[PDB]
Amino acid sequence: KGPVAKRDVLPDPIYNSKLVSRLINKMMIDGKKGKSQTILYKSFDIIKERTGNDAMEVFEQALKNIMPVLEVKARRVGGANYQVPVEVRPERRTTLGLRWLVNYARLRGEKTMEERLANEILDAANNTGAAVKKREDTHKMAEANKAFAHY
Amino acid sequence: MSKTVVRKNESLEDALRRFKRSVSKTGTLAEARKREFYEKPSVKRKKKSEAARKRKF
Amino acid sequence: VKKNIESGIAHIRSTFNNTIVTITDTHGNAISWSSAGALGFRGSRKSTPFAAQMAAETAAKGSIEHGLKTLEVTVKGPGSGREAAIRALQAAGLEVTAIRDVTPVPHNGCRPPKRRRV
Amino acid sequence: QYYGTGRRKSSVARVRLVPGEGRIVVNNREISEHIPSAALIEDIKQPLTLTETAGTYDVLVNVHGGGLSGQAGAIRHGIARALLEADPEYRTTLKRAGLLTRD
Numbered sequence: 327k328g329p330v331a332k333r334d335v336l337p338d339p340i341y342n343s344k345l346v347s348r349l350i351n352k353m354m355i356d357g358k359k360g361k362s363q364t365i366l367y368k369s370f371d372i373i374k375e376r377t378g379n380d381a382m383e384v385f386e387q388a389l390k391n392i393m394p395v396l397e398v399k400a401r402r403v404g405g406a407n408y409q410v411p412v413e414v415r416p417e418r419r420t421t422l423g424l425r426w427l428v429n430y431a432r433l434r435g436e437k438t439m440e441e442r443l444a445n446e447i448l449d450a451a452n453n454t455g456a457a458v459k460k461r462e463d464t465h466k467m468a469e470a471n472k473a474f475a476h477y
Numbered sequence: 478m479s480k481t482v483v484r485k486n487e488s489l490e491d492a493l494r495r496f497k498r499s500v501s502k503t504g505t506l507a508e509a510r511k512r513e514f515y516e517k518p519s520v521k522r523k524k525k526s527e528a529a530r531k532r533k534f
Numbered sequence: 535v536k537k538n539i540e541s542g543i544a545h546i547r548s549t550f551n552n553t554i555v556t557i558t559d560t561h562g563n564a565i566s567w568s569s570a571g572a573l574g575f576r577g578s579r580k581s582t583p584f585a586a587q588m589a590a591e592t593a594a595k596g597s598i599e600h601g602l603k604t605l606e607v608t609v610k611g612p613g614s615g616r617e618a619a620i621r622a623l624q625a626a627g628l629e630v631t632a633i634r635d636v637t638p639v640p641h642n643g644c645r646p647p648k649r650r651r652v
Numbered sequence: 653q654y655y656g657t658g659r660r661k662s663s664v665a666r667v668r669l670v671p672g673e674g675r676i677v678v679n680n681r682e683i684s685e686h687i688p689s690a691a692l693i694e695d696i697k698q699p700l701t702l703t704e705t706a707g708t709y710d711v712l713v714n715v716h717g718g719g720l721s722g723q724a725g726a727i728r729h730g731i732a733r734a735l736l737e738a739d740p741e742y743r744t745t746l747k748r749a750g751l752l753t754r755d
Binding site for chain 3: 478479480481482483489493503504505508509510512513514515
């Protein structure tokens with residue numbers, strides 16, 4: 327066996343970014359990529375409107391904040407069910423950040439996914455945020471499981 | 478424990494390199510490690526004839 | 535008032551269940567000590583190389599205030615933590631001086647107890 | 653009259669790259685007349701931007717079959733294929749894209 331390759335589509339006129347393209351690929355339901363594209367466009371527009379700054383930098387800072395450095399992987403060595411901290415590769419970090427962003431944004435609850443994602447990007451740029459709660463919990467678990475930094 | 482001989486002007490692991498090699502010629506790994514639980518006289522005697530000859534260690 | 539010992543000796547006891555770090559002077563007087571249980575490791579993680587590393591680090595950073603500049607190693611006992619222990623002892627900055635061939639090797643002694651399967 | 657076929661997911665782009673100014677006809681329609689959501693319009697010209705062929709060739713196509721996205725993909729694929737068959741000088745550059753998927 328072994329790993330496998332893959333690729334995506336970068337070009338996006340509204341805040342061109344490969345991570346933005348990956349996010350667009352995410353949050354998509356029922357094969358409706360157009361809905362996700364429109365939602366992301368309108369959310370970035372609302373961000374640019376409310377905050378006098380380019381949404382690209384805000385999104386980058388939100389990703390830098392939510393990205394988890396250490397992952398806590400379970401492992402059952404005997405009747406103990408231990409856990410092992412793990413160093414997350416940048417790809418897995420970005421994917422986990424996207425997952426948490428989307429999930430907690432849709433979990434927040436507002437009148438529109440656009441406003442939900444906008445407020446989530448804001449509460450991510452400002453470390454105080456839902457996805458950052460998940461980040462902090464994961465970091466706490468990794469710290470508590472530091473005893474198994476390496477087998 | 479390897480020995481009382483001191484070595485300086487090397488790296489940190491250069492000392493462990495010779496530690497793990499010189500500890501073989503001492504009972505620290507066999508004499509002080511076998512007697513963790515009792516062994517009956519019969520098996521105690523057969524263990525030598527087995528190991529010291531088969532060269533399994 | 536504090537006897538500022540220049541150099542001392544460290545006795546380390548490694549085991550499959552715990553690791554103890556003791557730092558002493560030339561006469562063996564207890565200067566500082568730490569163990570995995572003190573670090574926080576309560577389960578079988580006590581005897582881990584990482585736990586031994588943390589215990590040695592704590593002992594070294596505790597004796598640094600006591601003043602000894604260099605120390606001697608007198609590790610002893612089974613276990614794999616004896617490597618990380620000395621690694622942390624060296625990384626702490628307190629250079630080691632020498633070592634000894636001491637060990638509890640008995641000639642015959644008393645017979646150990648019954649195995650863990652009968 | 654350079655010709656090409658942008659076969660992609662049942663959507664065929666019967667493209668004939670003839671020397672023109674840069675007009676792109678889709679089933680006898682205009683770009684905006686046919687395809688809203690211009691996010692894909694800029695993507696169609698990906699190879700047209702990789703190689704400088706801005707306004708020297710016209711694109712008259714009769715795209716039959718497939719949705720909007722599949723039609724745009726077939727259009728750009730046929731454009732690339734016809735452009736390569738016309739001038740293979742930049743085939744070394746366009747081999748890193750290909751756009752052939754057998755979808």
